[PDB]
Ligand binder design. Structure first.
Ligand code: HEM
Ligand code: HEM
Ligand SMILES: CNCc1cccc(OCc2ccc3ccc(N)nc3c2)c1
Ligand SMILES: CNCc1cccc(OCc2ccc3ccc(N)nc3c2)c1
Ligand SMILES: C[C@H](O)[C@H](O)[C@H]1CNc2nc(N)[nH]c(=O)c2N1
Ligand SMILES: C[C@H](O)[C@H](O)[C@H]1CNc2nc(N)[nH]c(=O)c2N1
Ligand SMILES: [Zn+2]
Lengths: 411, 407
């Protein structure tokens, strides 16, 4: 069964055959669409077919489907599963898996880069200190003095779910958030809960507006431990505006390396609960969401005052105006410091090309319109006018519950 | 089976039971979501009638009453007899208001109950239709103090006697393809502008020519009619800081009056039911003016502002897009023509959502359409989880008449 998507700006029609290889559920039914819903210990019983499907995929990709190497590998995995209840991926399979998980991430606009991913195998890691070391190396390699390089570090896979490796931080580098007695928030409100945990775990908080959070690291199902990323490894960028000289006085900065660390990587049925990965920022992530979301730094007001906009009526579009200047400032600051960033026009334009290439070479490209379209200026980017089809392929990146809600404390 | 939606800005969680009433299909499946896809007999009829009458009589607190049962009996008999049936005025008004109430893509639904319904089911000719439409336009315009309205033409019989308004809106600008390769006026209307000419229209070949009406009564061939200019309220577009803006020669009409949809009530089909409300600023400034496949004026506006259009990263398009949208709102408000900005409208919709969750058990909503085409995440709807599902009465898309007309 074939499915067509239409770009309403170009009338380019594309045909999806890849959605047929999809197994996992969407949340949607014939009677309801959950397209805008944010989020809608395993036995041998289901493991081998999941392993087999992955290995069929891998061996097709390397043009060896049906080969003796293919068959022997299938046999070998089967035996290891029934003997040990799990299996180990080869390095080749791991690398292939991680890249394909990124390729399959329907909410990621940056996927044109998917084949250039540096995979760090951390499956020999055993302790939190070991995790700290690997992560430091990840940060140094990925940052590369501002010339950012996509990377992922993969810690050991889940066994019984009682020995999980987890990075408790949602991103490797994030700023602290502190709730004040007067109800106000100092720093990043998104991080208040996590900041509190760190403080409780013994972190001495400087209590500033931009304190880089410590790493909270869990190895082998043990209680997490605190570590401080060496500051010389944390690249930051002062935010100024090219024409507005007062903008620097807002005292804003951001870190250069977006490195998501709370997701779960699924490959051939194996679960990698600690797999921190990094790319580089699209400007709007910082300039629209991180600064201008009301539940975040929320600086639209102060920026608007300083611009002397008519803030009396919303129909002056003072919010829109201030939002653009902040986003201009973010891009300017990063470019000026030679730190890799991409604007939402460039990234969406690249995504469309990538998407079309994926349709031709792969039979489709699953894409979540709700997340692909940038959070400002939607319809003046070409993704807005692009019909997309959303469905789930493995290998994949999945959400997982926050470890503090599930963890069994050792003491 | 009882579904929750969360607002991630406020943590407010609403619970949806209304979705369980849904009948029609979304296009999505368990394996694939089609949320961003633009277009996904007597025995059929009586359950459809029943369902509607059931909800109508429940709405007036007379569910399971003599009046209810009688009407059910009467309609059942009339279906058995006539192979169709007619709505009571009360049912017609209720049905139309609820079609709007159910329009999951409409951000303006907080106004749903205040719809003026014009029953035009006595209409027999295109001239008649023209008269009715002129009355609608005049009433809804109200000298700039716009009032929502719908005019309902006779329901489908055997699909050979269809009433249709061939225009997609009662008021739209013509589009012409030049030999020069470009396009003058509105590119979206190039084909319809052609069919007007093919049918006998005399285009002024301008840039903002109000298109004539193309009216089809009783399945007959469509006829042309020129809306009295005095009934077409237009707004010259000027910027409250940039005096050069007026030299762009831009204007827009005050009355958005969608005329190409199909109204379904109780299984009955109204192929001709033009309706109108008032504009959200972005509809004109973002989509109509700055869409590449539309007036596409971003380039020229940017130049006039002397922005560094060398690199996308200067965000010059974004800057121009804002000012353009400032100007649209400024012009309408100055001329006292009703308009709403995307902030006010989205805020209103959140309140309406909460009202509906509170008083109806939910509110079908298509995030992809509700979130405005600029400044998305600084409007409250962006952070609002929504559930999309189809309820009846409803407005539906329908094929363009020319692709279908048995001439
Ligand atoms: C290299 C430059 C990259 C750019 C510019 C980019 C861009 C983005 C953006 C803007 C989002 C939406 C984030 C949000 O609004 O919350 C996103 C989501 C996502 N990205 Fe990428 N990305 C890049 C690299 C990567 C890499 C290297 C990976 C993994 C190896 C990845 C995997 C994902 C996943 C799984 C999501 C969905 C997150 C979720 O479900 O909440 N991306 N990306
Ligand atoms: C009174 C003020 C109103 C406002 C501000 C408003 C706003 C909007 C907007 C912005 C859209 C998106 C349209 C687009 O991007 O093309 C829309 C769609 C829609 N509106 Fe409303 N509207 C109003 C009144 C009405 C009325 C009176 C009706 C019917 C009686 C209606 C029915 C619909 C329907 C069916 C759609 C979806 C059409 C489609 O699927 O393309 N609206 N509305
Ligand atoms: C539930 N949504 C919030 C949430 C929770 C957990 C991870 C996450 O990731 C967003 C994300 C993921 C990967 C990215 C890679 C690069 C980049 N510039 N941004 C990126 C942003 C987002
Ligand atoms: C599918 N998009 C094109 C298309 C086809 C058919 C109807 C339609 O109408 C959109 C629409 C409908 C009703 C509206 C009422 C008020 C308003 N300001 N805009 C409105 C916009 C739009
Ligand atoms: C409710 C809604 O689904 C939610 O706010 C989503 C919308 N689209 C998004 N898109 C991106 N890229 N990132 C996000 O966090 C969100 N949030
Ligand atoms: C491809 C995509 O579905 C298309 O551009 C949609 C997206 N959202 C929209 N939203 C509104 N309000 N109006 C539209 O015409 C569209 N078009
Ligand atoms: Zn869906």
């Amino acid at each position: 069964r074939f499915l067509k998507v239409k770009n309403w700006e170009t009338d380019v029609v594309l045909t999806d055959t890849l959605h047929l290889k999809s197994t996992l559920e969407t949340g949607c039914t014939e009677h309801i669409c959950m397209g805008s819903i944010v989020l809608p210990v395993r036995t041998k019983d289901q493991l081998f077919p999941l392993a087999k499907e992955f290995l069929d995929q891998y061996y097709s990709s390397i043009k060896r489907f049906g080969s003796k190497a293919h068959m022997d590998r299938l046999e070998e995995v089967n035996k290891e599963i029934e003997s040990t209840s799990t299996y180990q991926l080869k390095d080749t399979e791991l690398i292939y898996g991680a890249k394909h998980a990124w390729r399959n991430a329907s909410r990621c606009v940056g996927r044109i880069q998917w084949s250039k991913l540096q995979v760090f195998d951390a499956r020999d890691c055993t302790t939190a200190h070991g995790m700290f070391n690997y992560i430091c190396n990840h940060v140094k390699y990925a940052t590369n003095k501002g010339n950012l390089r996509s990377a992922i570090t993969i810690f050991p896979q889940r066994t019984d779910g009682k020995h999980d490796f987890r990075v408790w931080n949602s991103q490797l580098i994030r700023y602290a958030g502190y709730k004040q007695p007067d109800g106000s928030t100092l720093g990043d409100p998104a991080n208040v809960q996590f900041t509190e945990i760190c403080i409780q775990q013994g972190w001495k908080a400087p209590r500033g507006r931009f304190d880089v959070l410590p790493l909270l690291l869990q190895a082998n199902g043990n209680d997490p431990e605190l570590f401080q990323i060496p500051p010389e490894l944390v690249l930051e960028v002062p935010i100024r505006h090219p024409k507005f000289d007062w903008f620097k006085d807002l005292g804003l900065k951001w870190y250069g390396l977006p490195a998501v660390s709370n997701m779960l990587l699924e490959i051939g049925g194996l679960e990698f609960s600690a797999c921190p990965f990094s790319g580089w920022y699209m400007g709007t992530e910082i300039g629209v969401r991180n600064y201008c979301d009301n539940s975040r730094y929320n600086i639209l007001e102060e920026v608007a005052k300083k611009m002397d906009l008519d803030m009396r009526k919303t129909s002056s579009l003072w919010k829109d105006q201030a939002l653009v200047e902040i986003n201009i400032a973010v891009l300017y600051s990063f470019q000026s410091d030679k730190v890799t960033i991409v604007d939402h026009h460039s990234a969406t334009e690249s995504f469309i090309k990538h998407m079309e290439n994926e349709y031709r070479c792969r039979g489709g490209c699953p894409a979540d319109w709700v997340w692909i379209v940038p959070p400002m200026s939607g319809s003046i980017t070409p993704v807005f006018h692009q019909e997309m089809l959303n469905y789930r392929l493995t290998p994949s990146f999945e959400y997982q519950p926050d470890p503090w809600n599930t963890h069994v404390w050792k003491g």
